[PDB]
Every structure is written in C-alpha cells, then in structure tokens.
UniProtKB/Swiss-Prot annotation, chain A:
This is Neprilysin. Disruption phenotype: Mice are overtly normal in appearance and size and do not show obvious abnormalities in motor performance or coordination. Nerve conduction studies reveal no significant differences between mutant and control animals. It comes from the Eukaryota. Thermolysin-like specificity, but is almost confined on acting on polypeptides of up to 30 amino acids. Biologically important in the destruction of opioid peptides such as Met- and Leu-enkephalins by cleavage of a Gly-Phe bond. Catalyzes cleavage of bradykinin, substance P and neurotensin peptides. Able to cleave angiotensin-1, angiotensin-2 and angiotensin 1-9. Involved in the degradation of the atrial natriuretic factor (ANF). Displays UV-inducible elastase activity toward skin preelastic and elastic fibers. It is found in: Cell membrane. Coiled coil: none annotated. Belongs to the peptidase M13 family. Myristoylation is a determinant of membrane targeting. It comes from Mus musculus (Mouse).
Swiss-Prot record, chain B:
Its main location: membrane. One of its GO terms (cellular component) is cell tip. The N-terminal domain interacts with the C-terminal domain of LAYN. An interdomain interaction between its N-terminal and C-terminal domains inhibits its ability to bind LAYN. In the presence of acidic phospholipids, the interdomain interaction is inhibited and this enhances binding to LAYN. Keywords: Actin capping, Actin-binding, Cell membrane, Cell projection, Cytoplasm, Cytoskeleton, Membrane, Phosphoprotein. The keyword Membrane applies. The chain holds residues 3 to 297 of 583 of the full protein. A 1,2-diacyl-sn-glycero-3-phospho-(1D-myo-inositol) binds at K58, L59, N60, K61, K276. Interacts with CPNE1 (via VWFA domain) and CPNE4 (via VWFA domain). Binds NHERF1. Interacts with LAYN. Interacts with NHERF1 and NHERF2. Interacts with MME/NEP. Interacts with ICAM2. Interacts (via FERM domain) with SPN/CD43 cytoplasmic tail. Interacts with CD44. Interacts with CLIC5; may work together in a complex which also includes EZR and MYO6 to stabilize linkages between the plasma membrane and subjacent actin cytoskeleton at the base of stereocilia. This is Radixin. A head-to-tail association, of the N-terminal and C-terminal halves results in a closed conformation (inactive form) which is incapable of actin or membrane-binding. Probably plays a crucial role in the binding of the barbed end of actin filaments to the plasma membrane.
C-alpha cells in the first residue's frame, strides 16, 4: 500500500 | 572479507573490491568517476536479486544489504534508467551520448523498440558511419558489412531480401553520409530513435478489473495504456499534467486524474512488488520532468 501525488 | 564487484557499462567492464558496508551511492560514485561521466541523473546500477527480478540498486543503502544474487563477482550493469525528452539539448557529454547510442541501438536491434524497415536501414547507415567513417571504394569491399548485426530481426523476417541486398541498401545510405564524424553520426542516430513510438518507455504487463490483458507504459511524459496486441499505439494516455494521484494497495493500482469528470484508471499487477517498481519509476521520472523546467 503506497501513494504519490503528481500534478 | 573483500566483496568482489563487476560493473560493466555498455563498452567497458570494471572490477574492484568493495567494503562490507560500501553504500550504493559510493559504488555508483566510483563508477561514474572512473568513466568520467558528469550527467549522472539518467543512470543507474542494475543487478539481479535472489528472486530473479532485474532490480535497480538503491544509493542510500549498503550495497551489501539489498539482496543482490550472491555470486563471487557481484555483477551490476550501468544503464540509462531514464531517457531525456530531447537527446540533442539534454546530452552534452560525448560519453553520455555514447552510452545512450549503444544502449538504444542494442534494443532497436533486439526488436525491443519497434522500428519500421526504411528507418531501420537509415539508422544502420548512421551506425556504420559511426563505426567505419567515410565510405571508401578502395577499402569497403562488397560484403564489408557481412559480419555486422545491423538490422532489427523482425525487419529481416518480414521483408525478405538477401543478406547482400540489405547490405547494398545500407551501403547506399552509408555512401551519402560522407563527411560525418563518429560523434555527430551517433547523435543523428539518436535524433531518429527518440521519435520511435516505443523509445524510452518501460512496459509492464497488467490486467483490468474485467481480467483482460494489457500493457502499462511509464515514460518521460507520463503513463500510457496499451492493448496486449499493440505495444505501439496508446489506448489511453495520461501526461503528468493530467494526473493528480497514483497509488497502489497490494496488486491493485489506481490512477486519479485532474478533472473530476474522468473515471480514474484501475489495473491489477501480477504481484505486489511489480507495483512498487511502477511507483518508483513514475516518481523518479516525474521528478526529472519537473527538474528540467525550473531554473
């Protein structure tokens, strides 16, 4: 479980 | 005890002893220093872990504690992990241009990056002009190209000409580059390759909720989804600008778009760690996509 935020 | 380490680049090997707590970075640093490479941002050290996965070696971690397959010489490959958006304005060092030319061409030759017939021949001529210099009636005698692996395999398989025909063809294209330098030639090569639909894009085999096979492409400019049958044309695209948040939770990966009216994309990886990588790749890649749009 992981998350990244781009624009 | 000394840990034995081999690090082949694309035209060089290097073998030295390593300290039982040498940090990935320290290793990477030595290699780049020995080769005299300044543009270090495109590159990585690639090894194979105990499960068999080709993995990128992490710089902020002991090179001895990342579970690389334990062979006597610990083996790594120094390859471009990220590709520039425009070769000519992004690759300044001759060294960098060279390590790229080589890595790119190799893949172009292995039917990895698709390349159609005419362009394949066009590229080959640039590759030979790089190798041999100006064509010369007196030197390069009929068949001077018989030993060189010059064209994508599929090219040869589909358009059936003779070996000496394809050669005549490249020779014709070779004859014309009279006056090009080994350096320029490799660049002219890259300028053509970087426009190929499969250039500088990492594919991952995936499936949607409906359980049908697909490909995910991570590249300099964002994510792309392909149908298993076509690795070239994207079915849906996602530039960085048009992506809000990417996440995974186990084998399930989800992309969330900027405009709320779009039904966020969802795919299923075959294992957890496959998403781990997809996430890693995107991050590093997006980061550079920003970094080259700041000062």
């Amino acid at each position: 479980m992981d998350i990244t935020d781009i624009n | 005890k000394p840990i034995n380490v081999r690090v082949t680049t694309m035209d060089a090997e290097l073998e030295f002893a390593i300290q039982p707590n040498t940090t990935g970075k320290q290793l990477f640093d030595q290699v780049v220093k020995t080769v005299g490479l300044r543009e270090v941002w495109f590159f990585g050290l690639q090894y194979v872990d105990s499960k068999g996965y080709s993995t990128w070696l992490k710089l902020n971690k002991k090179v001895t504690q990342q579970d690389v397959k334990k062979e006597n010489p610990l083996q790594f490959k120094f390859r471009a992990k990220f590709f520039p958006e425009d070769v000519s304005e992004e690759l300044i060092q001759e060294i960098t241009q060279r390590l790229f030319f080589l890595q790119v061409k190799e893949a172009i030759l292995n039917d990895e990056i698709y390349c159609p017939p005419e362009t394949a021949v066009l590229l080959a001529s640039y590759a030979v002009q790089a190798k041999y210099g100006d064509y010369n009636k007196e030197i390069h005698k009929p068949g001077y190209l018989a030993n060189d692996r010059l064209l994508p395999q599929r090219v040869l398989e589909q358009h059936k000409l003779t070996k000496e025909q394809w050669e005549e063809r490249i020779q014709n294209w070779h004859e014309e580059h009279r006056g090009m330098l080994r350096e320029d030639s490799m660049m002219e090569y890259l300028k053509i390759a970087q426009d190929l639909e499969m250039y500088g894009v990492n594919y991952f085999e995936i499936k949607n909720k409906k359980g049908t096979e697909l490909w995910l492409g991570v590249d300099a400019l964002g994510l792309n989804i392909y149908e298993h049958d076509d690795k070239l044309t994207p079915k849906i695209g996602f530039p960085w600008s048009e992506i809000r948040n990417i996440s995974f939770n186990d084998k399930k990966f989800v992309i969330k778009p900027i405009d709320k009216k779009a039904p966020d994309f969802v795919f299923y990886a075959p294992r957890l760690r496959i998403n781990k990588r997809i996430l890693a790749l995107c991050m590093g890649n997006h980061e550079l996509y920003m970094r080259r749009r700041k000062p």
